[PDB]
Symmetry: D2
Amino acid sequence: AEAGITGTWYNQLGSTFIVTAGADGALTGTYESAVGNAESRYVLTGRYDSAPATDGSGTALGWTVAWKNNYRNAHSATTWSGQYVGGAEARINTQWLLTSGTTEANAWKSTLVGHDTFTKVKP
Amino acid sequence: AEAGITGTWYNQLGSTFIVTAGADGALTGTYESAVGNAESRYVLTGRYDSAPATDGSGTALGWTVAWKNNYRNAHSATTWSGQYVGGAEARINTQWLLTSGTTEANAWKSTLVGHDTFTKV
Amino acid sequence: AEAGITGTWYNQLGSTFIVTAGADGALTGTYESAVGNAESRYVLTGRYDSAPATDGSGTALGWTVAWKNNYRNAHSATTWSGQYVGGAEARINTQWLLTSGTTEANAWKSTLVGHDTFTKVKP
Amino acid sequence: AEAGITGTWYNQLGSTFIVTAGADGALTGTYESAVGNAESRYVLTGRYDSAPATDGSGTALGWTVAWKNNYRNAHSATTWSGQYVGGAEARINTQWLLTSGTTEANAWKSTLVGHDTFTKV
Ligand SMILES: O=C1N[C@H]2NC(=O)N[C@H]2N1
Ligand SMILES: O=C1N[C@H]2NC(=O)N[C@H]2N1
Ligand SMILES: O=C1N[C@H]2NC(=O)N[C@H]2N1
Ligand SMILES: O=C1N[C@H]2NC(=O)N[C@H]2N1
């Protein structure tokens, strides 16, 4: 649902996710990470299932943040893939992939995998 | 390099990816998968490092596709994370996450992982 | 440390992991899953860093369970990769990959990825 | 098929994997990586479906390598999960997880993921 996803969300590391769910299935907003070679806000763009099921199923969605802004460039991008679960305590449970740009040689070790949970605060 | 991400790419499954990379890091286009509960094109949006490093590195990028369009709603979303490398042969090497919208009971098995390599061939 | 890893462990799904850490860096034991096309115990085999660092670093380790035993055969295998963190509340935090055997055609969708946390109970 | 997993396999990085598949599902052998903070062989142990399905499916298997041996201790472990397919050309297609032992502060970035394909060539 757009309304449920739109808002301010934070995860266990203390990072901030600000998102708006457009009715066409789009997500736009900013991401502030609490860890990494990252400083300030970064632009995020994603997509979500604007039409989930009447099943207590989560709404699938995903987004990307390239870790480059006007203050820093970390030459990497992360994509979060998870599902939004609404209710009184709405959560977005995800798994993510962080890929750094590398030489063909260190490519075998270019992606880190992790998982974050987001708790909503504001709309 | 970078600006050369714009174009039509194909992966080993025969899926077609059409992207436009914008001056500031945005990625926009349509995706058409050869496999799955998917038909026709789906919209995709992503981001890429618009200022990759000397050095001899690839350009990090990623994008998302919610598999819902005027034809099908497969209640899932896929995100590809990888890097683009240009040269006589340019490719995009990625690892993807496909999450379906499940009930809690099946949440443990909601995400598939795989890897795709795209070329303009 | 072998002693710290050896014991009975359970995760958030309610599955049981019984393991013994041999001094050569080996792990052997049984796994009982609470979910899936699984019934009874399954054999697990793994390896761990018998020599972690004097740094509050976790001990890296991994293990595999082929979901075949005398009662069921699910034609799949899972590998858990994580780190053991000892203390009063010892945990093993992992990320796992579950691969099912498939036809070359459905191979694109043969692996599921997830993460489990194990809490120790007994040695 | 299955019993044919025994042998020496090589992956695209040039790493060598030597395994013995036992009648009941066990996998034993040594691994030697072409890349990383690793030197010589390391011991590996794993498991495989000793009774794969008609159908036309691969045999699911997985194994672990703790990168510690009499030469180096890289304080990490890698697990490969995949399936073996036999035929004139047999391969093992895998996705792996490499976890390093970190302090909590760096736990978020302790696991790398990748994919390897092994052949007997
Ligand atoms: O909040 C964060 N999530 C994690 N994933 C990532 O790429 N950086 C970390 N920060
Ligand atoms: O091209 C495709 N890549 C794979 N991942 C995914 O989500 N669907 C499949 N199609
Ligand atoms: O305890 C379990 N862990 C999960 N991973 C897996 O493969 N099956 C599930 N059961
Ligand atoms: O052959 C290798 N595979 C890759 N994964 C890993 O752990 N080290 C690398 N070497």
